[PDB]
Design an enzyme around this catalytic site. Sequence first.
Site, PDB file in Angstrom:
ATOM      1  N   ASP A 148       5.880  -3.673 -16.077  1.00  0.00           N
ATOM      2  CA  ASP A 148       4.347  -2.939 -15.807  1.00  0.00           C
ATOM      3  C   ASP A 148       3.685  -1.369 -15.900  1.00  0.00           C
ATOM      4  O   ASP A 148       3.960  -0.786 -15.212  1.00  0.00           O
ATOM      5  CB  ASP A 148       4.064  -2.921 -14.511  1.00  0.00           C
ATOM      6  CG  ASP A 148       2.815  -3.077 -13.778  1.00  0.00           C
ATOM      7  OD1 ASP A 148       2.041  -2.961 -14.734  1.00  0.00           O
ATOM      8  OD2 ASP A 148       2.245  -3.099 -12.692  1.00  0.00           O
TER       9      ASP A 148
ATOM     10  N   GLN B 246       0.634  -1.692  -0.346  1.00  0.00           N
ATOM     11  CA  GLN B 246       0.285   0.153   0.108  1.00  0.00           C
ATOM     12  C   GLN B 246       0.560   1.361  -0.066  1.00  0.00           C
ATOM     13  O   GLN B 246       2.108   1.218   0.725  1.00  0.00           O
ATOM     14  CB  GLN B 246      -0.509   0.117   0.898  1.00  0.00           C
ATOM     15  CG  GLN B 246      -1.982  -1.109   1.321  1.00  0.00           C
ATOM     16  CD  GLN B 246      -2.763  -1.079   2.205  1.00  0.00           C
ATOM     17  OE1 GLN B 246      -2.538  -0.749   3.842  1.00  0.00           O
ATOM     18  NE2 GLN B 246      -3.693  -1.592   2.632  1.00  0.00           N
TER      19      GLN B 246
END
EC number: 2.7.11.1
Length: 289
Positions: free
Chosen positions: A143, A28
């Site tokens: 990514d 996170q």
Amino acid sequence: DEIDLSALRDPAGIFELVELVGNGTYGQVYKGRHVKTGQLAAIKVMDVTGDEEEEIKQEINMLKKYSHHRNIATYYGAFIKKNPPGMDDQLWLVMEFCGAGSVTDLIKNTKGNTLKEEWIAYICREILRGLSHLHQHKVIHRDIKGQNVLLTENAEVKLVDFGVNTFIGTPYWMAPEVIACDENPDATYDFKSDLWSLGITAIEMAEGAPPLCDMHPMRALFLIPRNPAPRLKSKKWSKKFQSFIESCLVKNHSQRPATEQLMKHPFIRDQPNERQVRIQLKDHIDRTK
Ligand SMILES: O[C@H]1CC[C@@H](Oc2cccc3cnc(Nc4ccc5[nH]cnc5c4)nc23)CC1
């Protein structure tokens, strides 16, 4: 590498968490603040466990080594919040805070959810420069997409979440050589796979969403190897932009240009309004309050 995780300071009194920003590659991410200076920084929190320990050591080593580039969000430091035995320690990856958000945000905050060519040309170049920096050091981004391309409040363009067992991610940015199947059982990530992902991103910028977005992920995964390379839907766009999309999206990866070739593509070089495009971006960023 030669990193010792247990010799890392506790973030207590040095960094603190303000608000949540979103989720990343196994962790996170918060908008953090530097306690004694009040300066903002991005903080990725991860749980340190069994498998993930040596993987953590490598990203930290990686970020230390290669993030000092102007198109890579910069590494500030790392802290462990040690938790009781039997439990997972929390690792804080502290990094440069790009306050304008992702390109995805930029897209949504632009009416009609499309960007100008001049805008797209600027961002792709910057993205490429960061890619070229990585590829030179034998690092594959893995990514690339509008969500991982950040803008700073001075409209600088930075890359995040790079180079980091049976799940399958979202397929829409994947290159045909990445999709394992019958005709291709040995599927691995190549440096040229990043260049395909970039091509998708450019459409993401030009259309608000990637090709095949209106389709079940499993069906999109299936179609990408077989369908012809995605093209720009409208013909409004210039010929150089369309060529650059054609160049990025070469299905056969052996036939796909290398990072340095795309850098030389006219859609990338011919940016006379570079200084101007940046100002338009910075104003649009301020405008968001
Ligand atoms: O977008 C993704 C990108 C990867 C993840 O977080 C990051 C990872 C690594 C470094 C980061 C630096 N600055 C920001 N800043 C920042 C600010 C506002 C945002 N709104 C939507 N993403 C926003 C990112 N985020 C970062 C999760 C969010």
